[PDB]
Amino acid sequence: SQTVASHVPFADLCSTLERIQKSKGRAEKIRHFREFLDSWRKFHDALHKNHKDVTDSFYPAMRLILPQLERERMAYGIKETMLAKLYIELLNLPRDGKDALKLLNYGDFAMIAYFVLKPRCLQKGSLTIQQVNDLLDSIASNNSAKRKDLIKKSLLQLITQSSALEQKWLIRMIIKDLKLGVSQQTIFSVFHNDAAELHNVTTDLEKVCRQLHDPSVGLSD
């Protein structure tokens, strides 16, 4: 019943992505990712120590790290132009104001929002990776259900309880373009030797994460 994702602050995922994006070289980008992956695997073993048929895996993080491969969640229905409006309303921005204009007259959108949010209010987030996923789930469902009001509420929960850095990264997760500077093939290859292969055949991110959870146990076993 318990999940590693329920114990990991979204902020630690985001600070990892930030250091990855910020690294110049491939080796450094890999090192930041590997560190988070390795901790996740150590914690998984401590958490699920004496448990039976465990289905928990790295999927709740991996689906945020490779969001373009997201298949379980339907489309979010979220455009950068409407996030702009959501922030102007939420932050009580005057539309003649400098921050409002930056958002309206839209180095992606995530970065603009980031510069706007950085000097403001909340500096430390509270959400776990699981809670972020549960909320992205509501957003996707409510897009299918054609409930734009419930989408705004869920998004508002995600945004208001998160730091600027988390919001930058959340935005990129929703748009499905992290701009990390490391390929999907590289990410898969750090995770597991066989992961790129398994994903080719299954097109199934959760299956890959769960079946190849143990780096020393290959597809052939």
């Binding site: 602050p9 630690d12 901790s39 150590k42 914690f43 958490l47 120590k49």
Partner: peptide, 10 residues
């Protein structure tokens, strides 16, 4: 016996 994430990463 519940592990704290902070002694694994944070």
């Amino acid at each position: 016996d519940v592990p704290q994430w902070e002694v694994f990463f944070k």
